[PDB]
Amino acid sequence: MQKQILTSQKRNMYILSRCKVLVKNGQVCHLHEDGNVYTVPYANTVFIGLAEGTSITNEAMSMLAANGVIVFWTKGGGYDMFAADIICHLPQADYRPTKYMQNWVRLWLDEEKKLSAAKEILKMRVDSLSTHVHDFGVDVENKRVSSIVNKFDKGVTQATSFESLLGHEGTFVKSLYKEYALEYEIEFKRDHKSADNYNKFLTLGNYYAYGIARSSLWALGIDNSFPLLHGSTRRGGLVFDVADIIKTSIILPLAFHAADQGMSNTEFKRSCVAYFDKNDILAYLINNIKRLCME
Amino acid sequence: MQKQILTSQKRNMYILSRCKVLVKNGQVCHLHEDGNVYTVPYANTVFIGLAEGTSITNEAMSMLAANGVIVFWTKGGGYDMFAADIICHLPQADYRPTKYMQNWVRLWLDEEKKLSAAKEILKMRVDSLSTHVHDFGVDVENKRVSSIVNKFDKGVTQATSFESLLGHEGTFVKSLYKEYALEYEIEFKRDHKSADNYNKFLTLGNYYAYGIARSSLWALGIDNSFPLLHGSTRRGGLVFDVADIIKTSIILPLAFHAADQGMSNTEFKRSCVAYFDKNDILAYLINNIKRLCME
Amino acid sequence: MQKQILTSQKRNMYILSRCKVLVKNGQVCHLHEDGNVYTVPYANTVFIGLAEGTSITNEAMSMLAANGVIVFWTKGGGYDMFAADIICHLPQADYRPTKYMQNWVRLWLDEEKKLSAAKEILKMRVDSLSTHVHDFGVDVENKRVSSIVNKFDKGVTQATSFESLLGHEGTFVKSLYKEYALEYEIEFKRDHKSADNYNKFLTLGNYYAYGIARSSLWALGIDNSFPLLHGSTRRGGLVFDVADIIKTSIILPLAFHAADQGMSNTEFKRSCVAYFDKNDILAYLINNIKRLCME
Amino acid sequence: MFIRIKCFSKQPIAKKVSREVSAYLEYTGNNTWEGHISGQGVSNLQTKLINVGKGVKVVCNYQDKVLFAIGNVAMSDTGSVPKYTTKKVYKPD
Amino acid sequence: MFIRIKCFSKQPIAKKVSREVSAYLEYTGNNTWEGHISGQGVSNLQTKLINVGKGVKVVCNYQDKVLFAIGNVAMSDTGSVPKYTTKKVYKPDDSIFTLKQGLVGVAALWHDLGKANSYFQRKLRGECNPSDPVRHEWVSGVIVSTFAKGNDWLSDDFIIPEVKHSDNVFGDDQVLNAVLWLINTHHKKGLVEDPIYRATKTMFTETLQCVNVNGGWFNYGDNIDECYKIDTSFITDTYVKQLNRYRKKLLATKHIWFTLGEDQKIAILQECRVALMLGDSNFSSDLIGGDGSHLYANLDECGNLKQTLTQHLLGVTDCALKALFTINHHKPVKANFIPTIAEKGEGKFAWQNGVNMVDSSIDNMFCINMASTGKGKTLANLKLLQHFGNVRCSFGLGMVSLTKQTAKQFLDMGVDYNSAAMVTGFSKSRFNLGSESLDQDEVSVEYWGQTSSLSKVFPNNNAGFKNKKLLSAPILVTTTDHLVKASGVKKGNKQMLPYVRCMHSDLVLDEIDDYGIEDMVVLARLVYLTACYGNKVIISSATITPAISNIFYEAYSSGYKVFCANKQTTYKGVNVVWWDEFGIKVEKVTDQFSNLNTRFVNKRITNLLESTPKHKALVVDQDDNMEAVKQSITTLHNAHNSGGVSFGLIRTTTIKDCVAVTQELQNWETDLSIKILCYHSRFVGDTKAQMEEYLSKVLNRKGDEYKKFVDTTTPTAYIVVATPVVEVGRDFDFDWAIIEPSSERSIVQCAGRVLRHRSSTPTTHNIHILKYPFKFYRNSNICYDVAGYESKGYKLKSKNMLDIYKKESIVNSVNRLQGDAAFYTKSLTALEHKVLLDKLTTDIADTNVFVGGWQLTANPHEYCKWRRGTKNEDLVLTDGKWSGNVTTTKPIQSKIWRKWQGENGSITVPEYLLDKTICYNDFYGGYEN
DNA sequence: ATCTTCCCTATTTAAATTGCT
DNA sequence: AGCAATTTAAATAGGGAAGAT
Ligand SMILES: [Mn+2]
Ligand SMILES: [Mn+2]
């Protein structure tokens, strides 16, 4: 149905499902499933999303883009977007890359800001862990998890190279995997090819994390070819680097809870998008990328 | 999964008009108001433009973006005079190759390397002219075209800025517009809002070269927010910078021939597919932009 | 009953091989020995041919003849050098225009008039070369071809006997066949019982030109039984003059091109249709016998 | 002159027009004919395709423009030949 | 590339293929699509059009030639798209198909009559030895022979009589004898040990009367009386009427059986036996469940009683009848029309336009492709196959890696895996490292392809991956041993799959000279069997000997005589297509093949001789070959080097010879910088593969890319000491070679490893031939028998190569192409030609090539063994630890340039050398120390 | 809403047979 | 031998309903 997502401060990423978007009486509306029309205010939204069962028309597209309301096509849920155009400074007056994009590029270029931003993305990944506290998952304030957190903090702060950061990131990620395996009474080893519940649930949750990180990178105009940790030849490595922030804080406890209770995949999708809507995870990633790129 | 066709090796391109695009038994098909459902080869489509009176569902965008089809709309900022925002959704769900972004932005940030790259893309205009010859119009080897190509190269060699570049563009394009017009015995003033065929076919070819240029950009991962030409009248970004390589070599001769030989919009559209696949213009632009970024 | 389609603008053209030719449900068709029934467009067919293992029926032959399709049978050659005997069913139930036969008789009975017609028809192959120029093979206006047709015209101008015409005929055929052989870099000897593709493509074109010549002669009511060129070697009828007007202009370069590119026989059938249709070789032959008859 | 005739007729009338359209053009299969004919050939084909009865569903294409359209066949607005035809298209005020 | 796809399909199989074909092409209406697409788009459209299910009816046209045809759609013979196809097209005097139907039906209702003895009943129930004293096929043959001796076997009531033990069941009646041989050899063929019988027996019955019970059926023989006491519970309704209708069918058609020739009878009975095992294994594979008890034939996996013998005989009959029908009335699935073949060859491939001199409508073709290496022989073979239309062929090649090379050529030129099927039946662990994504190589085993209609008559729907790739392949690029079993096997049903493969497909055998003599005999048997069904044989061998070319033509001529008289057509002769890089010649040859073949050979020789001599060989005078190798290495480095760096190949004969030359050269004190490699075949999986890839990338001299795989800066002698593994299938280019003489084709092949890629002529000498083989010091009586055609029956009078070879000679294929039978005792070339005509002769013998009468027996598969090697046990290295008596050793570390280590893999050791330790080493594999 | 699957729904094609000329 | 009438039946198209996202 109609879904509101706060992204930066005031603009809202509207998600529209099972509706036909067109122009009625000179302004953009949409007929919904229940046969009731709903209009959209142009002032409070910049991102508008078209989920499953949704069609838009040409003059609705044109009038939405002329009002600064830039449209994207997404899979139902609002965090699995497959089609959009690039954010500019203004949609009609000029065509310039966003300040965030340019800042990211400059930071990526000079080697020192790239290393500092790699350290910072891991700092905010540890922050994400504490910030987004779950109920079924392990305690972030537990002594073993806090020891892993301080080990990662020491290792990131004392490192001067990227391959050290990759080893430390892998140690932290799989150490949280080991901690959640110690919670849920299983021998868990992370492999994509396994058909067990924990590994495949973590895989499709990671794909959801890639989708929401892709939406967060798109919404500030950040391109998908400037990874911090991963190599220059890794296709879409920045999506993986941004999704790393919430892979071990949100996706991992939800996936282990989902494999523990053993429910099906669509209701895991609704749990993931419910956690994304409730705690504003996309807005957290948007502010994370602003604080990374602004420096 | 297979190779899923290289996007340089896709041959079908469409700009649909006055239709409802949808999915009927897994088929990208546009339905008109007369009850006719025409399918689209979505795994072989380069782009689908959408004209006025058009509409497309979610699932059609879902299986066009999964097959790498760029979908744009010809209204909004599509009046082509300002050329501000032709609403152009790309498939960024596929994680693109990154290295062309890296070499492109290394030369972008460096303004002297951007100036040199602009000169290479300005020389690509005359390269396109020489490579893509037409047997129903202007001979490239006659004295006027050779003189104006020599003047263009000797002006772009000694060029100092982008303001000097903007001017050389004025000369080349405007005088090639004119030289064709005098040989086609027609008083012609380029106007995107004009009704004569010499302009409606030119705007249709503008949208076609827009689609080819944007598909060539997205193929390499290159966006649009990184243009090489900066000016007051050059709003629109990198897609027009790539597209105006092939106005005066391809789009303009086809449009002039079409208007003079009384073709209909449908056959001009087809003449455009025939020239874009017989000489393989998409792979031409893709390989040439690899030559542009390179290091 | 309408204009019944004039013969010179009839376009379809076949030689049917290994199929029994019949009528199903209204239309003439041919049924091969695997169950495949392919329809013959009898209202637009110029001629059909019947190779080994073919068998036509009565009402099929009637629907070809009453519509005016000349039908022959390809086999019958039993000598070592000559295409011996081709059996050809004339549609005489259509009562023919008469005075063209009277003109042909008044030139045939007068010996000096037959010699005069023999003269002009020998230079008719020379002008056939000049008019029908292919895009491939040789160029007609080179020094060797012009020298040999100039020697041929000089010798046929001073000729006074039909045996001199037969000798000059032999030197002309040897000159062209060997020059084409030189161009296509092969050794060529014209044997109708040879497995080489340059030879059986030439016999297939012999059958094609035979069918074209009986349709041209029957369109003006001219019988094959009035050969204006006769001899011991040259004993086939008028078809062996109006058929080999168009060997060295149409068939022999097309046969050499088909034997050089080397796909199957069907591309040669379709190429004979394409060149007999595009340049209107049937109407060209009919109009040439027209300007022969009234002069 | 090179034409191509496509037929989407129902009933035995589809077969009765096939005799006449197969008298003038070659059969490319799947109820589609294609070939070279003359100007008056197209006319004789028109005269004996229309007179054969009601319900003839014939579209002819010369190069790429539509030569003729027998009946109220929607045929081509942009592309030619639909698929899942059906009702309730527009239904306006 | 512009294509057009038309659909003939019923169902919603005109609908769910429409989604995929409308994903790639535009819709022109009336279930016809047409548009532009790439070749990889054609491959993707093929892969997702075939995999979508069964019943897809799709024809594709590229320009006007048919690209592909999904299913058994008749589509185009001349025109395309027919009208309705109903029934009753031809209905001839089919005769021989009625003959095969009658023989297969009569034999298949009698093939398992011998399981009714009490011994087979307690064997199935399991209280005796599962191996019978006499096999049940022979007991059923005894039943049928006793019934024929008693009553008239063709028109009478059946009733099984009291049968005794008979040593022979074959009489004189030709048709009864055919039924008896089909009954007895429905599991294995009889084997004749008798030397006089093997010497003399030629005819059909006159050989069949020598097939006794002692040829494999009579295992041990102590319970014969229980093996011949039989119940008669088969007399039921449907069995008796099926037997009556098939017996009367045979009765009505056996009048054309006596009008057949010997060759016909043999080939027809081979087809009948193949269809009979097809039906028998098809009914034995599936579980039918129901049974009428009191008698049983087969057992399930649990050992329970199933498939009672009446319905077992009826099921084997109908399955064999259906096998016969689908193998005798199949329009097989052919390959795509490859668009990168049909254009002109340019430059050095310009001879490949010789296909424009061949008729495209010939039913048969025998190509002898005598073109030299590097000219694209296999591409020319594919061009010749595609000149006649769509391609259906079996590219049978020696070695796994040569099949890989031809597959990679087929992949990168135009052929996808929807038409090609690379088959190597060992599952080797040679993987490509470095970069999986940036490989663009390593042709693999997937075969999206198209499953043929013949899979339903094979046992349990053919098999899994391998036999589906075998049978259903349009183009089958395979190792040759998946095709030579078509001629017949000892035990089992392994004949049927290559038989039915070669029935409907052409055969392309490349470089047949590298095979053994018995290997070439069974390959020409395969050529005869392929020509028996009208398919075309392409032989591609440059160094062909007239003898070989002749016996392969005679095998093809006997096969085409079988095919001509089988369809009741008068035999006009064989379309022989002589081919090389200088020209082509197509002649209808029914007789005088020898003068035309030798005239083409002489024309090719004169087209080779006015070209510049590329291999000048000097036979050394130095007796001792160790120091002859030393002096020749020094001389050819001082004469033939590229700025101080030279590449030498020491071709020796055997492995311990190779390690002897290596250990001498490593200890050889000289100022030359010798860098030694060992290149024999006894090596562990890892080590061997590593040598291959390195050598292929350093001896590539078409470019200067090798300068970076070796140290060319310092003047160095890069020497590779190798056995005959270098002269077969290796694209190597050495600066010079030193050859230990074993055979003259070895000399020509190692000349082909020198200046293979360059075109610069040598000045003085680029080959130094050794004075003697090293076996002269071990066996002066015979020394050239190892990797040569010298033997105990063909002994050279002198072993001196001044006596038996020219001292200075330009080595090319001319000496092998000419053919000389005189003076074979004192020249190597005439010794070679002698053996080739004295083993591959136009006789039937028993191990020969025209084999007739013996195809009925197991003799050509026992005494003519394909890949006849020594015992060969395999010592296997498992993670650094060897299995048997291996003992790793240490090499001399004097001049080793490259040494790759190995941990896994296996080494093939002959049983003779198993007695001692093979002493595996990292540098050189196996030796005697 | 969009799209899919399935059940009517009967409308729509292909085969089959067989006097008749 | 082609065809016509005329049956017979297999299949194609479409609309409505319900279940998914
Ligand atoms: Mn058995
Ligand atoms: Mn059995």
Short mmCIF file of N, CA and C and ligand atoms in Angstrom, two decimals, chain E residues 111-112 115 136-137 186-187 280, ligand 1:
data_model
loop_
_atom_site.label_atom_id
_atom_site.label_comp_id
_atom_site.label_asym_id
_atom_site.label_seq_id
_atom_site.Cartn_x
_atom_site.Cartn_y
_atom_site.Cartn_z
N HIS E 111 14.85 -65.69 -27.98
CA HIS E 111 16.17 -65.35 -27.46
C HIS E 111 16.37 -65.83 -26.03
N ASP E 112 15.30 -66.02 -25.28
CA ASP E 112 15.39 -66.41 -23.88
C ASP E 112 14.55 -67.65 -23.60
N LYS E 115 16.23 -69.93 -20.60
CA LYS E 115 16.14 -69.67 -19.17
C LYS E 115 15.12 -70.56 -18.48
N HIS E 136 22.25 -69.45 -21.35
CA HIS E 136 20.86 -69.66 -21.73
C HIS E 136 20.58 -69.30 -23.19
N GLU E 137 21.41 -68.43 -23.79
CA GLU E 137 21.29 -68.17 -25.22
C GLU E 137 21.61 -69.42 -26.03
N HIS E 186 22.90 -62.86 -28.64
CA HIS E 186 22.16 -61.74 -28.09
C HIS E 186 22.77 -61.22 -26.79
N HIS E 187 23.79 -61.90 -26.27
CA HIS E 187 24.59 -61.39 -25.16
C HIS E 187 26.06 -61.24 -25.53
N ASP E 280 16.37 -55.97 -25.81
CA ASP E 280 16.59 -56.81 -24.63
C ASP E 280 17.02 -55.98 -23.43
MN MN H 1 19.20 -63.29 -22.26
#
